[PDB]
Amino acid sequence: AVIPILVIACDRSTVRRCLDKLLHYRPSAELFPIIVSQDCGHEETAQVIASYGSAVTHIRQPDLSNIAVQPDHRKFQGYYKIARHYRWALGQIFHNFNYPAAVVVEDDLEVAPDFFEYFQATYPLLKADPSLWCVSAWNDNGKEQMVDSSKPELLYRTDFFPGLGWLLLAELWAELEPKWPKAFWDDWMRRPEQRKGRACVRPEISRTMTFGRKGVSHGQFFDQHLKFIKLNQQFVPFTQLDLSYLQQEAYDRDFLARVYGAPQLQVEKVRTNDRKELGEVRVQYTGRDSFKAFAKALGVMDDLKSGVPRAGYRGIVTFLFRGRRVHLAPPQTWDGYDPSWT
Ligand SMILES: CC(=O)N[C@@H]1[C@@H](O)[C@H](O)[C@@H](CO)O[C@@H]1CP(=O)(O)OP(=O)(O)OC[C@H]1O[C@@H](n2ccc(=O)[nH]c2=O)[C@H](O)[C@@H]1O
Numbered sequence: 001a002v003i004p005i006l007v008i009a010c011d012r013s014t015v016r017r018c019l020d021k022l023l024h025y026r027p028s029a030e031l032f033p034i035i036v037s038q039d040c041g042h043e044e045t046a047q048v049i050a051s052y053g054s055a056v057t058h059i060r061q062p063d064l065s066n067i068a069v070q071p072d073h074r075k076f077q078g079y080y081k082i083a084r085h086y087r088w089a090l091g092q093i094f095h096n097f098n099y100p101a102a103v104v105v106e107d108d109l110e111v112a113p114d115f116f117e118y119f120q121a122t123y124p125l126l127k128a129d130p131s132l133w134c135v136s137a138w139n140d141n142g143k144e145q146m147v148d149s150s151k152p153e154l155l156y157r158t159d160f161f162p163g164l165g166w167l168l169l170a171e172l173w174a175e176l177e178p179k180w181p182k183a184f185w186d187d188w189m190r191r192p193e194q195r196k197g198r199a200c201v202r203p204e205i206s207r208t209m210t211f212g213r214k215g216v217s218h219g220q221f222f223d224q225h226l227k228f229i230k231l232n233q234q235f236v237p238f239t240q241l242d243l244s245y246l247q248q249e250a251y252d253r254d255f256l257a258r259v260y261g262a263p264q265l266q267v268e269k270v271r272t273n274d275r276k277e278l279g280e281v282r283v284q285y286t287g288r289d290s291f292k293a294f295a296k297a298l299g300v301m302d303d304l305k306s307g308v309p310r311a312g313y314r315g316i317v318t319f320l321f322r323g324r325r326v327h328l329a330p331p332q333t334w335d336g337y338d339p340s341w342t
């Protein structure tokens with residue numbers, strides 16, 4: 001199966017950093033053709049992409065007109081342009097080139113040495129399990145002190161769509177295109193009407209890292225969070241590993257049994273590093289306020305999209321804190337997300 005890498009670009013010449021790493025690590029030009037879709041028309045960026053010659057296929061979004069935004073969105077024209085470009089580019093991949101799947105990579109992402117190996121290994125899982133709707137290279141809680149460097153091979157399921165280096169099947173584009181939004185496509189994906197209870201595979205250590213401090217947005221989120229996401233540098237031969245543990249049946253039984261079988265500790269004890277003999281614990285939250293309070297106390301992301309926490313799975317956020325494995329989890333009676341948890 002051929003899995004193209006669709007690179008989304010606009011007006012940053014640093015797309016060079018992105019393409020250099022993709023081309024350096026690519027194991028096969030035939031199995032992983034690179035298609036660079038460029039919006040905007042920025043001449044210098046176009047010349048940079050063109051300089052790679054036949055190593056990539058350069059396509060150009062055709063409609064460079066301004067978009068009529070709704071009354072609440074005067075400040076957000078750029079987000080409307082991002083959504084328009086995604087719809088056109090994905091249409092080229094799935095309707096024109098007619099590929100079976102694709103890995104979407106924004107121009108300000110640097111990939112890890114095992115980026116291709118990771119997607120090659122997980123594609124069959126995505127094809128076989130309809131409860132999965134994507135595979136992502138991104139760990140939303142992937143800061144250095146929050147991940148286990150001794151387990152670069154460990155993967156998880158997450159209900160929180162991460163994007164930022166992600167694989168989708170042509171089958172999913174068939175479902176999304178007819179209702180593609182005018183703006184904020186990532187948060188639109190995160191809504192239950194789109195997600196329909198499906199999960200993505202995500203890693204313990206991220207296979208992408210963004211360097212786009214300057215972009216469409218204000219550098220706030222980048223400066224406070226994104227810049228700290230660690231890029232994996234230890235090559236893991238995922239295609240040689242047994243990933244059967246990620247199938248829904250196995251995961252929902254074993255991973256959940258692991259989380260709820262682990263000893264419970266009060267957040268304060270985890271914070272101060274008490275009871276260190278307990279290498280894996282559960283910190284229970286019971287409502288929106290306690291979730292946010294406990295997430296912040298332990299240094300993890302505390303925002304929610306449609307009621308789902310960053311990297312959460314059945315409400316559980318899993319990470320490392322001062323060397324200890326911690327599962328910030330709801331009571332075992334959990335039965336669905338509440339979008340009102342904002
Ligand atoms: C870290 C993070 O979560 N970033 C997400 C991004 O993944 C997502 O797609 C976007 C959806 O609203 O929200 C932010 C944007 P954010 O990450 O803040 O901003 P940017 O990198 O500038 O833009 C995202 C992508 O859109 C492209 N672009 C930009 C301007 C334009 O007119 N046309 C165009 O196609 C860029 O080349 C880039 O590939």
Ligand SMILES: [Mn+2]
Nearest residue numbers: 108210212215
């Ligand atoms: Mn960006």
